[model samples]
Structures are given as structure tokens and as C-alpha cells.
Target: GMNTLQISNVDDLISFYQYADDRIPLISGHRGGRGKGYPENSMETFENTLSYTPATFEIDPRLTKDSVIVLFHDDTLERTSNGTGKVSDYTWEELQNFRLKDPEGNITNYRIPTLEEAIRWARGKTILILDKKDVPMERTAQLITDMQAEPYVMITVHDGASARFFYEKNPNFMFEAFVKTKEAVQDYEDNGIPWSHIMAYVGPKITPEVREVIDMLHERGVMCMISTAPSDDKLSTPESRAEAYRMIIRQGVDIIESDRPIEVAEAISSLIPVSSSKGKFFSTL
Candidate 1:
């Protein structure tokens, strides 16, 4: 009972994200979904989300003491795992003893998955938008290059320089950029980063300023995302969250990255356009 987005090639993946007036709205699983039994950043959580919604994933990749890269969110393990100190203090092997804890602090059997493992696992399922963590830009770029993951993976970048760095490494790399203002969009252009390779995250607000940013990005054929992880996803009621989701989509956005991907998808299900080119890219498993 899983819903999967089937993207077979890099060009198709790129095309699926491009802006279109009739494009179906997409959801990205924030930290790959955290709930009662699912742990954030675990592969298990990613699979769980697919059971209910077709989603791309936004995951965190951090380095261990031994230089192995793994899927994790915090600088320290205390927040989501049964470990202490910075994640960098433990070697990949040492991390085996720790169990991941869900958002509710309930422990689960999931272990930390190496980035390579994550990349390999995601090959035929869904796309992964890797968030910037402690891993060096070069290291991340190198890892993705070695794995040939440019097709289904999108890099998270905060500034034009960061995007430029990866663009230099591989122009094939797509980005989820934090560009909340028109000035920010100018910065990416100023650095000569192409709009086709960018997806702008214009913060979580339907305000004039944020909407202006999305309008500008849309004008350039770029997909715009509004992440509700820090906003509506945390709203006290499902009704409130549903109202927020519907409002954001109605205001015009191509994607919504949320902590509650399943609920968010259901909330906005009726909002997705019935007939669209984007439909071919998605299918249930």
C-alpha cells in the first residue's frame, strides 16, 4: 500500500520538478517523516511515508568520526538517538549500539544508515533532497559524484556561493535553495546559477513578501517550495493544518516540504489537479 514517484532518468526527474501552470502539487518528507513508531532520518520512515503519499524526501547527512557519512539530523545524538556527545565523536561502527528514537522519544529498532546505503536504496523508489549538515560541500559533492546520484538527489544550499561550488563540481546537480526574497533570487542569478537547476524554498508564509518571491521564481520556470516544518505542520489541529495546506497550494506553490507528509498529502489531496503531465511521474506500489 505504498505510493511511489517513479522517476527513471535524470532528465525526467528534472522535468518533473519544472514549473507548469497545471502541474500537480508535490510534497517532500521533512527529515523523512517522524511519528509514534517511525524515527526521523531512518529509511524505515521513508518507506512508511510512501505507504500513504507520493513524496520526495529531505534528509540530513552527517559525518561520523571515522569519516563515514550517515543519515542523521542533529549535531548531537541526544535529540533523536540513544547516544551522547556530538555525532562526530563516534565511529560508524560505534554508532551501531545506538537506537533511533521517534519524535515522541519512543525508541525503535532502526539503525543509522550510511549515505551510500541511502543512495542505493532510493535508486528506484523516490527522490531524496539531501539537506546540508556537517558534511563538507566537497565531501558531499564527491560522494554524490562517486555514487552517480545527481539524477535523483537534490542538494540543499543556503547561499549563491554554495550553489556555485556544487555547480562547478557538477552542473547536473539540482538544488533546493533557501531563497526567501527577490534579492536572494538576484544573488543566485548574480552568481550565474541557472534557474533550471534550482528549486527555491521561500520560507513558510503566505505574506506579500514570500508570495512575491515565489512569483519571481515562477516567472523563471523554477519550482517554489514552502516548508511547513516550523509552521503549519506544528499547528495544534489536523483541521488547522489542512486549512494551512489548502491555503498554501491555493496561493500557488509547486511543492510543500512537511514533517507530516502523510497528513499533508491527505489534507491537500483534493487540491491536486486531476489531469496533468506530472501524473505520469507518480504511481502507487
Candidate 2:
């Protein structure tokens, strides 16, 4: 396996995570980990993922009318990129006409990459946390398979019903149940599955009752996680941050989503090396 051709720089991420090994937490790049000066959903942002041990490169994919899966996070290009209009309105080629600029207004000369391009970009290196919305769920599974990236690829669904629908239809695809409480975890666990079979990336409503719910799910060996997005924004509070992570870590969650990954990684690294894939290489990008 070591001799097989792999994505360049993919393996070096272990050193980046060496900074936070003990927590063994899964770190995701929020909007391709772009909040901290990186380009959102751009190949440059995804490339930065190679520098760290992000558990998964969380990116959004939208389907163009021509049926191309393009890497994008917003419905329209207004907020993050220089383009104007909905992602659906522009074909992949038209979208390519736009360029990415850094927060300081210096254009990076990077363009939006397609899903296939990202798959090739991340191929054998890191897992994918796709946040595609509106596109058909079956197409999502097909695209992952077409990319030859399975197991590590995760697709998001808002409710258990949606998860169950796809879970039943396509047993092979990884699913992250986008839920908001303890009851949600219970309902998903009741379905009977192996630890590798499911990911419960819950939102902030992680109350005392929710903690117990996570405990039960952990008992079943189901991986679970919490978010730091505005929905669960309370995670930013000191007390809430400690308690939520304490319980999630105790449960051995497979992954957790956070916008403040650098701080989270530093805290966990202070105790032990987190699960990073980069260690053997370094460079000043």
C-alpha cells in the first residue's frame, strides 16, 4: 500500500495533527476550513487541508444544469467569491470565468474546482464531508462511487427520514445525520448498525439530556459529533465548550465539526496528539 501512487502531500498531514494527538478528535475545515484566511471551497482552501490533520475536508458541491458537480458553498457567488448570481444559473464553464480573491482583495488566481477535480485533488489523502443541498441524493452516492472514493466520503442529510431513505437505498454510502438533540441520536441508534456505518453530526442543542443521549449512542459504538456553527454557536462559550467536548471525547466520537479548528486543535494537542495525517513533511505555503 505504501508504494501505491498517492495524492502528493496527503500523508504529511500527520505532523500537523501531531500537535493534538491525545484528544483523537476529528477536525473538519469549516467551509473548506476557510474562515481563517483560506479561500472558501476553492482548491487553494482544499490544498491547505493537506497542511493539517483535518479529519475531513468539509466542502459544499452544487450541480450545474449541465450535470457537473462543482465545489461551492453558497447558493449565489456574492458572499465569498467574486461572481454574482446563483450557482445553479451558471454552467460549470461560465462559473469558471470567475476568479477567487482573498479577504484583502488580492486575487489568488485560483478558480472553482469540480467534484471530480477535488476527488483527484484529495484522492487517497483525506476523507470528504460534502454539504451539497438540493441535488438528488442518489446522484451524490453515484458521484462518490464514480470518484472511487468510498467509506471515507460522507454526505449530509437533515433528518432521520432522509438518512434512512438513502441508508436503505444505498447501504454503502456514509451518512451524517444532521440532528439537534438526544432524542435524535436515540432514534438513529435504534436502527442497529456498526460503528463505521453511521455518523451523527449533531447541532448545538446538546443539552444535559443530549449528553445522555450521546452516552447511549457511544455505548452502541455509533460515532457522534457537535458543531460550532451559529446554529450551535453556544459552543463558543467557555463553559459550554468544555462540557460538550468533554462528553463527546468520552464517547469516542469519530469526528466533530468546528469553525475554530486551530484553537480546538491547539487545546487537544496540548494534552496529546490529535488524529492528523501529516507529520513526515513541511513547507511554508
Candidate 3:
């Protein structure tokens, strides 16, 4: 009972979260599940991660000089690519000359991919969490709308203003927003963002206040998530990481954004019984 719900489209995703509190917590592959051999934000990595478990890809999008939206985490390309200047300095065509480097810094055959390509590939495959880097909210919203990918995509908004901007453009667009305080929740409410369309990012720590926020959002059917990528030391070992995940599950977090996707999923799956687990923890456990 590992909760093998196949998320093939938006409806499945929305319903998955709406009632997923009793099921296993969903996993978010940070930076498109990048690791040793995979390049960060590459479609191949995202696809490969999805092959293991259905996940929401946390990806970064930046603009090229010619206004093309491409997947690259840094403003400059020296870290993950062969280019030396800013990503905006080159056109999408010129970026093709540069290849993505593996974790060890060797250039691979993978070239920089456009946002369109990533979105096209994600259709019916997995959900996307668009990390706002250099791409403007208007452009990102328009692109997803143009592709009719509103259901399959979720935008990350740091504050109330950005959230309102996207909500104004398309109220149906899903969002992974920061709602750490009651005031923050109020801001979204005042802006007309329905709780059903939000996934609250309550930071890495699950304090009492974080729990309160989660309860408030849950009352209105909003999902909540916390990232462990920032505190690698606490999640450094398997035992420690498993314990941390268990704690997160106890805190009622709906999703966990992690750097180690495979390990996190396995850790979560281990807590539930194979016969009747469904990734949910019973009181007897």
C-alpha cells in the first residue's frame, strides 16, 4: 500500500494534495533531481527522477539575450555550462554552443534546454515548481498559460506582491508560496488567492508557529511543504535523514523538497507497512 497514485495530469495532482494528508507525503526533487551524473535543471535528470517516483520538479528559469526562456540556475554559465558570461548575454542559439557539465565539471552532450522544451516534456509526466530566478512573473505565467500547462505547473512566489501578480493573471494557476505567519496568510486572502490553489512553503524548521500555519492552511485545503536541502548536516546520514523525514511527517507537512530524492522516498516508504502502509502512519505505529 505504497500509494501508487499515478499523477498523469492536473486533476490527479490537485486531488492528490487535497486529500493526500492521510497518504504518503509527496517528494519534490530539488533542481530537477540533480546529482552526481545529472546536470541541474536538465530535462534528462527530471525525467530520470520521475522514472523512480512521481515528483514535482523544482526548476529555475532564466531569460536569454533574445528573450528566450531557458533552464539554468545561475545568472552566469560557468558553474554548469561552458559559457563564461551571464546567461542573458547569449541567445538561445548561441547557448547551444555550450554544453552542460556533469557534477565533476566535464562537459556532456546535453545543451541548455528551453522552458518550452521542459514544459512539453512534463506534460502528463510530472508536475513542475517554477522557481522564480530571473524570469519575470508575467512572462512565466504567460508561457504556462500558452501551453495550457496551468494544472501541471506551480509557481514559487517569495512574498505577497508576486503571489498577487500571478493570481491576478490566472487564478487557476497553482502556487508554492511562503506563508509563515498569519499575516502572510491574510495577505493571500486579501489578494483573492484561494487556499485550494496554494502549497505553503513554511521554511525548513517546523516550529509551533509553522504547525499553526499548516493547520490554518489545511482548514482551507492548502497543502504545506518544507525544504531540507538547507540543513544537509541534519539529513547527512541515512538514519538521521530518516528520522528527520519522520519528524516532518509528524508535523503534517504535505511535501518534502530534497536534494536526495531516492533516499527520501525510500525513507518515507519504510515507515508504513507494506501490506496496508499506503505511506500513512497509523496510531498503532
The TM-score leader among the candidates is 1
Q: RMSD for each model, in Å, please? A: 1.1, 6.4, 4.6
User: Which runs of model 1 end up more than 4 angstroms from their true locations?
Assistant: none
Per-residue lDDT for 140-198 in model 2, tens only?
87777675465456677766666676677666656666645666665665664333556
Question: Residue 146 of candidate 3: its Cα lDDT?
Answer: 84
**Model 3 local distance difference test score:** 0.77
Give the TM-score comparing model 3 with the true structure, all chains together.
0.87
Model 3 stretches with alpha carbons more than 4 Å out: 1-12, 19-21, 104-106, 233-235, 272-285
- Ten residues in sequence with the least summed lDDT for candidate 3: 276-285
Q: Candidate 1: deviation at residue 176, Å?
A: 0.7
Task: For residue 211, give model 3's deviation from the true position in Å.
Answer: 1.8
* Best-matching candidate per lDDT: 1
Give the C-alpha miss distance for residue 14 in model 3, angstroms: 3.1
lDDT ranking from best to worst?
Answer: 1, 3, 2
Candidate 1 Cα lDDT to native = 0.88
